[PDB]
Enzyme design. Structure first.
Site, short mmCIF file in Angstrom:
data_model
loop_
_atom_site.label_atom_id
_atom_site.label_comp_id
_atom_site.label_asym_id
_atom_site.label_seq_id
_atom_site.Cartn_x
_atom_site.Cartn_y
_atom_site.Cartn_z
NE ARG A 58 -9.31 -0.62 -0.45
CZ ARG A 58 -9.79 -0.13 0.69
NH1 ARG A 58 -10.67 -0.81 1.42
NH2 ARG A 58 -9.37 1.06 1.11
CG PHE A 63 -7.76 7.14 -1.44
CD1 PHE A 63 -6.42 7.05 -1.10
CD2 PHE A 63 -8.70 7.22 -0.43
CE1 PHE A 63 -6.03 7.04 0.23
CE2 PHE A 63 -8.31 7.21 0.90
CZ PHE A 63 -6.97 7.11 1.23
CD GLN A 66 -5.38 -2.62 -1.08
OE1 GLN A 66 -5.00 -1.65 -0.43
NE2 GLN A 66 -6.17 -3.55 -0.57
CG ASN A 105 0.36 -2.41 6.86
OD1 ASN A 105 -0.39 -1.57 6.38
ND2 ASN A 105 1.08 -2.19 7.96
CG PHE A 116 -0.99 1.68 -1.37
CD1 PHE A 116 -0.89 3.05 -1.28
CD2 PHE A 116 -1.95 1.03 -0.61
CE1 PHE A 116 -1.72 3.78 -0.47
CE2 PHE A 116 -2.79 1.75 0.21
CZ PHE A 116 -2.68 3.13 0.28
CG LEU A 125 -1.73 6.65 3.63
CD1 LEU A 125 -2.22 6.02 2.34
CD2 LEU A 125 -1.81 5.67 4.78
CG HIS A 129 1.02 1.91 3.94
ND1 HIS A 129 0.49 2.71 4.94
CD2 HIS A 129 0.06 1.00 3.65
CE1 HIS A 129 -0.73 2.29 5.23
NE2 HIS A 129 -1.01 1.25 4.47
#
Ligand SMILES: *[C@@H]1O[C@H](CO)[C@@H](O)[C@H](O)[C@H]1NC(C)=O
Ligand SMILES: *[C@@H]1O[C@H](CO)[C@@H](O)[C@H](O)[C@H]1NC(C)=O
Ligand SMILES: *[C@@H]1O[C@H](CO)[C@@H](O)[C@H](O)[C@H]1NC(C)=O
Ligand SMILES: *[C@@H]1O[C@H](CO)[C@@H](O)[C@H](O)[C@H]1NC(C)=O
Ligand SMILES: *[C@@H]1O[C@H](CO)[C@@H](O)[C@H](O)[C@H]1NC(C)=O
Ligand SMILES: *[C@@H]1O[C@H](CO)[C@@H](O)[C@H](O)[C@H]1NC(C)=O
Lengths: 181, 399, 361, 182, 399, 360
Positions: A58, A63, A66, A105, A116, A125, A129
């Site tokens: 990703r 944003f 990952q 997660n 992340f 967020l 996390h």
């Protein structure tokens, strides 16, 4: 005030060929145990399985980027060294903009071994996390990789490879200001 | 005392899945040692901290009849100073907090005795048959619905060199092994040898209760993601956490009375011990102990006709003065009083704040229950019996 | 904004959730409709003060209330008595919070209260007043904002602009004021005029009000936090109290009056000193000595007052003055106990219970 | 000389700020629209485990309508029905005739949830898109009181309007009511 | 009455979320029972009513050449009176009309077998492991890309109390299981036990087709809000609804010929039955049924060379009289004739009204398609072959 | 209006009805009498043209001779019936495409409802009154009052117009139907004892009335707004039940209006008149069919049955061989149509229609 860093873990990325550079991480060793040791042991390659030759699936634009799933590149796996999962310790820190790593997660106490990363200051967020690090150098490399062309699945067409992922030791815990990167 | 057990178990599994039998046996042994070392450390630390800075209550302190503003502040400051002393001691001598917590599935695999499975396989491979039958029998006791374990035990017993004295458990608490052995020895009319095992059962039960009271002073649990909006005050968070801790301490009397070979916890655990003791001392010839134990039973259940008849018989045959001079046990008195007070406080909290609670015992009188939730309790019992009957009807329809 | 205000009798037509009225006022402000924004900002300030008064009141029927005492069969188990008392107090709080007008509506979050206690709304207020030609109240609100935040830049320029224009030159007044500030102002002003009886009356009226405000501000600080760590029992009911202790410590410097751009140092000691001098000037030494002893209690190291007590002791036996007449008044002793106990408890708590994981740089 | 039939009633009791403002008595058509009526009654009574109790009217448009019924979130995006998240609209045999008629509100085709209307003017343009399922028999002055409350730009009322009480009433013999306003 | 399935499924998922296992297992069992009960009720009532009032026309009614006006009114009155009688019987027998409808998400989730997932979890948690493994196998066959369910199933199999003869499906109709089992047994060369499964498959297929053609009369489907401006007549709304119903009846031969495991529906379903049956019959020792099934397969397909050679071979070994005495089955005759008539009607409706229709079968002779549609298809084929040759030329230029 | 015909409509007049009504209303707001009145006349011509076109289409589709059916379909009746229905619908679509009047925009049904209630006639009469076009104003008022005869201001206007002498010369209907005029002529001929003329009027009033009745009966199959989404058979049944409700009213609307109260049983009464005329002309051979037709339409008459008893006392005197006691086919067909309509509606009302709307 600011939290303390203990160890530095350095990745060496490459976009297929003509590598981009080296991304250093400073890991909060005293603020969050049980998540730094897992990450360092996974990186350096002491338990056999490790981060070497991973894939940043990703690469959502501005944003996150990952990654870290070393078992298969689908993006719904990954096993830690503390069994398979392990719980969250404490969200003493929050996401303060670009460069603040976390752990990904799939629910509650479902930490695995996936990264992340942030590129814009995310506020929704905070409190879900756990955060365990903050990039130190080479943020231009992250800014460069986050621009690659993707399909309508966020998986980059040009594969990204972590050629090396070692561990760098620091002889003194030095704090870092909590602004960005 | 050692590295975290979950890491050791994961390493053992990874080594076993590729045929490194020495590695898996060593890793499993290390994990099974580390868990017990950790539990012993927590128990000792908590008991010492509780006993080194005691609750110095000041009933002699009448705050003020005239002034009313600063007296509450003084009381609060003194109480929280004592609390801060205790917390500082605990934090200093507990040590690192990472090793003391582990995932729930890890506790699940440590309650099903999976390391004993891996150990029995690896120890059969290594040709160490004694430490193979030990682990196999322990796992089988852990799960009685595995006939594969039964045929494995048969295959081991067929080989020579197996000793009957080596059929050890090594996992269950002594206060349960001794009780089961005592009841088995008693059932076949052996009163002479029946008493010591039951007496040890009471002693170990009281010791185990004391050890298990000081082990659910643990982290507060939340309703999933409801802790983002938790907005309670100081004197509300304190009372919430203490209510949950009291719930733990009062529900740790139904865990000391459950054996994995039995699908339901024992009914009336401890008064049954006293009943068997009085019957045994009746059969032996020691009758003062019989009358003492019958009376100590009656204190729990004062409305039993049959045991009243038995006590009348014992008193009639014995001397009246000796029976009158003999009374209940002391530790039973203290246990009953403390449990009664905890139940009273928990019921009051249920009545006012609205936090659920299910009684884990039957000797509880009716005076402690408020006359508001008995309606709800029989209502829920009605729903449970209706659901059971409806499930039975569905099963009948399926056929 | 504070003229038509009364906690015990609040108009029922101005009782709405605080965040809704504040957001309505801000949105009306951004649309350049001044008068309605002025009205709704004033309403939001009144409602904030009402909420604070309600909390500080309801947090004091529980502490300062007598409680029963169970029998010996419960008196022998302190670990149960203490937490039973705490359960009873929590129940009293939860029952006394139901029945007040300010608590049955929708409560605000923490960030809005942070802005309100930061004295940010007054900013908008001053501008709004200058857009309704209410210049005296405009300078009053600008000065009230600057009084708590003297490091501002834009507000200093705006205050210079207001002070430059004539007409508004003696209207520099605070709007977040208490009773003891003005009472002490009158007492000092009259004392400078050598008028004695009014000075002693003002001081004896000022003392209980300051102590009442201090104890309310102490007992209103037992508030909530945000959960950010999962720990044990004794390590989680003794880490909330550390934050509460910081809040309670930062609670005496906020109540000190500020005069001429300089806060008054050692407020209580100074007030007792003024009382002592006013007593002595009238040749009424009956109650002058306890004030002197209280000042010594608060300020141990002095020279003039030590000479004063030496002079008192030399002639102790001619005024018919007894030793029990030399003890400090009880309220001063209670204040001293509370302040010293809190300070030493924080000194003990910033050595063990706080974690060492944060640095400055 | 023709009208639909009322089978069951559902009654509310409302607070506007700090004052009780009375009672609203709905008559619900069970014959014509049984599914929506059953859902609304099972939500009002609240025996399923959730209900309209302590919810709030989160939209009030002067001289147009008053809308509420969301209990999950409270700002206008939640609301879960007894029949899952969403269920389709049944039939449009009835129309909006003017003040007092209560219908259901959806955010697209066949997306009925748990958010209702109470119309206040003749609503021709909403005919054939929303399922009318009741009329406010008694207590219309309470809706007139609720409608004129001061509102901000989003039209959420400045004060809070709360459904403090909500219950149901049985009708032993269905009786027909006219098809006029009020 | 029989409560709706969506309500029961929602209650079950809620009780599963809260954590009451008996509640969820009971709720989902009830839902899965009531859905099939509703389907059976619809089928039975619809078939019985439509078969009690037949459509037979009046033999005595004759065309009127002299008066050309009244005959139309009388004809319409008679036909619509019969229709009114049928509608009255349907309305009386069916019952409440609300229960037979439920949203798209609920149908989509009932197609993927989610209640079996919740039921297997709850049955594992209530210790009824036989039905737990049954539901696990049902889900696993329902969805082939679920590895966690595979791990669960392997654990259950290794877990005690589970056998290998208890594996059922409970969801797939017999006409698919029998065919798959027949083709599997025939794959391992057991022709002796490969004919009966195919006989049962054929008969159950015809039963299922007859039963599930009658569940196609459903509400007309308007796209979006197009029912506000729908302004059709009577004799046009009737034809529109009936053409859609015929289309949904003809798209029922491509729903029986697909399986959840397989990605693409089977090709030539029923001719494949006859082909495999022919091979098995030839291998066993039957020659009469071999030639009969070869002839029946020839009826569907008139250009298959392999089956022609097989027929010639069997005529060689048997007698010409035996081949000429035995003819094709009656079922193929009726099925083919009915489907051809429906296809002709639908193609005419597509040609005139412009309502699209894609052919769900490959045995339709080319003469049924009208001239205009044939020309359009020929143009499409020409442009497709032009595109193919252009692609080939482009690839050649690449080389 | 005799200023146009079915095959004589001009070219410019083919314009949408809704636009014509809207512009006419705008001109009426502007007091421009001539423009508004002329455009309203154009609108009424358009409405009558639409009615004629719809009637011709729906009476040429149904009256189409049935083509020869195939053989293989003789064992599947449902497919046969619905295939015939599909053929009819396609023929309807083709024929409607073939007519010009349907090539323009279709007005909303509420405009049609207003036109059926003759709302434009009040505006026409008000414009004529404002224009002092008195005879046309009286004609429009007389046309309108047939539906709302209780209007107070219409009554005042009618009285004021009748105050002027000769107002009875302007009382008439602009939409008078031909069979009504022929029946009036027949009644006048009967009153004057001119028996020879009356038979022609009766024989011209029968087929025209039958054509009008069948046209208005078979042009009723129209649209319907969709209120509920139902099954196949049930939805078609509800559609046809509403069409039946619209159908059973034709024999009531078509009843002639004479003297302010409609004459009951137009066909039966005219048949009785024909029988009386035949008896006056001693043509009992043709009178017997009229008698049996009257009995078939009206069996509840004792005077009639005693009349046939008197006829049958000496029926052989005149020389009838029972052929004259067979009723005319048209009367039988009309009776069967009406009886079937009424019985079908009663059955549908009792068993099919939903009962969820109550009284009061
Ligand atoms: C009964 O047992 C106790 C100790 O168990 C002993 O002291 C006592 O002497 C015994 N009594 C008799 C009669 O043996
Ligand atoms: C609060 O204090 C007042 C003061 O006397 C008292 O009357 C009242 O009962 C108290 N409320 C409660 C709930 O104790
Ligand atoms: C407060 O401090 C004084 C010091 O003079 C001493 O008596 C004691 O520490 C405290 N007194 C009371 C009554 O708490
Ligand atoms: C062919 O199979 C059928 C099975 O239905 C059997 O009845 C018949 O006997 C077989 N043929 C011969 C020649 O036996
Ligand atoms: C009806 O249409 C057909 C085809 O044109 C033809 O019979 C005729 O033109 C029309 N009229 C009548 C009365 O048939
Ligand atoms: C017409 O009506 C007569 C008598 O009502 C009846 O006998 C006949 O069957 C009907 N139909 C026809 C076609 O004559």
């Amino acid at each position: 005030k600011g939290p303390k860093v203990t160890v530095k873990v350095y990745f060496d990325l490459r976009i297929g060929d003509e590598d981009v550079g080296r991304v250093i991480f400073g890991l909060f060793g005293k603020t969050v145990p049980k998540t730094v040791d897992n990450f360092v042991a996974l990186a350096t390659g002491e338990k056999g399985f490790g981060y070497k030759n991973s894939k940043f699936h990703r690469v959502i634009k501005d944003f996150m980027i990952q990654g870290g799933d070393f078992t298969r590149g689908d993006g719904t796996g990954g096993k830690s060294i503390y069994g398979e999962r392990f719980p969250d310790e404490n969200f003493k820190l929050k996401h303060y903009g670009p460069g603040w790593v976390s752990m990904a997660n799939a629910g509650k106490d479902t930490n695995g071994s996936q990264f992340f990363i942030t590129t814009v200051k995310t506020a929704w967020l905070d409190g879900k996390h756990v955060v365990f690090g903050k990039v130190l150098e080479g943020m231009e490399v992250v800014r460069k990789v986050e621009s690659t062309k993707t399909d309508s699945r966020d998986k980059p067409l040009k594969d990204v490879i972590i050629a090396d992922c070692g561990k760098i030791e620091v002889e003194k815990p030095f704090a870092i200001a909590k602004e960005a990167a | 005392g050692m590295v975290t057990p979950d890491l050791l178990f994961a390493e053992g599994t990874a080594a076993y899945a590729r045929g490194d039998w020495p590695g898996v046996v060593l890793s499993m042994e290390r994990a099974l040692r580390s868990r017990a070392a950790l539990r012993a450390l927590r128990l000792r630390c908590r008991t010492q901290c509780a006993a080194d800075f005691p609750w110095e209550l000041d009933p002699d302190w009448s705050p003020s009849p005239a002034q009313a503003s600063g007296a509450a502040a003084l009381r609060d400051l003194s109480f929280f100073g004592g609390l801060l002393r205790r917390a500082a001691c605990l934090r200093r001598c507990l040590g690192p907090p990472a090793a003391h917590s582990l995932s729930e599935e890890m506790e699940l695999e440590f309650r099903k005795r999976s390391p004993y499975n891996y150990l029995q396989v690896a120890y059969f491979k290594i040709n160490k048959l004694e430490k193979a039958v030990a682990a196999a029998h322990t796992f089988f006791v852990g799960n009685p619905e595995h006939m594969e374990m039964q045929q494995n035990l048969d295959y081991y017993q067929t080989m020579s060199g197996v000793k009957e004295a080596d059929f050890k458990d090594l996992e269950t608490q002594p206060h349960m092994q001794e009780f089961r052995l005592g009841v088995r020895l008693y059932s076949e009319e052996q009163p002479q040898e029946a008493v010591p095992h039951l007496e040890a059962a009471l002693q170990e039960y009281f010791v185990a209760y004391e050890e298990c009271r000081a082990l659910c002073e643990g982290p507060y649990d939340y309703d999933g993601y409801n802790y983002l909006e938790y907005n309670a005050d100081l004197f509300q968070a304190i009372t919430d956490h203490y209510i949950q801790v009291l719930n733990c301490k009062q529900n740790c009397v139904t865990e000391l009375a459950s054996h994995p070979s039995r699908e339901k916890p024992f009914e009336d655990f401890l008064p049954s011990h006293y009943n068997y003791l009085q019957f045994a001392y009746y059969n032996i010839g020691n009758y003062t102990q019989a009358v003492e134990c019958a009376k100590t039973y009656l204190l729990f259940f004062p409305n039993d006709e049959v045991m009243n008849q038995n006590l009348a018989y014992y008193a009639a045959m014995l001397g009246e003065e000796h029976t009158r001079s003999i009374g209940p046990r002391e530790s039973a008195k203290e246990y009953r009083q403390r449990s009664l007070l905890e139940k009273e406080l928990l019921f009051f909290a249920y009545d006012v704040f609205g936090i659920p609670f299910v009684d884990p015992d039957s000797w509880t009188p009716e005076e402690v229950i408020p006359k508001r939730l008995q309606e709800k309790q029989k209502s829920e019992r009605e729903t449970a019996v209706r659901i059971s009957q409806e499930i039975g009807n569905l099963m009948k329809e399926i056929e | 904004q504070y003229e038509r205000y009364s906690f015990r009798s609040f108009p029922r037509d101005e009782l709405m959730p605080l965040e809704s009225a504040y957001r309505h006022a801000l949105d009306k402000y951004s649309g350049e409709h001044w008068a309605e924004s002025v009205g709704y900002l004033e309403i939001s300030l009144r409602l904030h003060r009402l909420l604070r008064d309600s909390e500080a009141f309801c947090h004091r029927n529980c502490s300062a209330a007598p409680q029963p005492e169970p029998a010996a069969g419960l008196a022998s188990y302190p670990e149960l008595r203490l937490f039973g008392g705490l359960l009873r107090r929590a129940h009293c709080l939860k029952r006394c919070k139901q029945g007040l007008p300010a608590f049955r509506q929708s409560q605000p979050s923490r960030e809005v209260l942070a802005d309100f206690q930061r004295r940010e709304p007054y900013k908008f207020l001053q501008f709004a007043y200058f857009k309704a030609n209410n210049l005296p109240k405009a300078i009053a609100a600008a000065h009230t904002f600057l009084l708590k935040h003297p490091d501002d830049e834009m507000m200093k320029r705006n205050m210079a602009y207001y002070k430059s224009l004539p007409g508004a030159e003696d209207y520099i007044k605070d709007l977040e004021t208490k009773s003891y500030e003005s009472l002490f102002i009158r007492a000092v002003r009259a004392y400078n005029g050598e008028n004695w009886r009014t000075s002693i009356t003002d001081m004896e009226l000022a003392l209980p009000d300051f102590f009442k405000a201090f104890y309310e501000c102490l007992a209103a600080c037992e508030g909530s936090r945000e959960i950010k760590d999962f720990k044990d029992f004794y390590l989680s009911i003794a880490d909330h109290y550390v934050e509460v202790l910081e809040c309670k410590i930062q609670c005496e410097e906020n109540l000190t009056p500020v005069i001429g751009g300089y806060p008054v140092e050692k407020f209580v000691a100074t007030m007792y000193h003024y009382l002592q001098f006013a007593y002595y000037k009238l040749n009424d030494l009956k109650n002058a000595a306890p004030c002197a002893v209280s000042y010594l209690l608060f300020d141990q190291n002095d020279k003039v007052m030590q000479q004063n007590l030496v002079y008192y002791q030399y002639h102790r036996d001619t005024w018919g003055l007894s030793d029990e007449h030399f003890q400090p008044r009880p309220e001063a002793v209670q204040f001293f106990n509370v302040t010293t106990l809190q300070k030493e408890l924080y000194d003990f708590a910033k050595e063990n219970i706080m974690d060492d994981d944060e640095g400055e740089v």
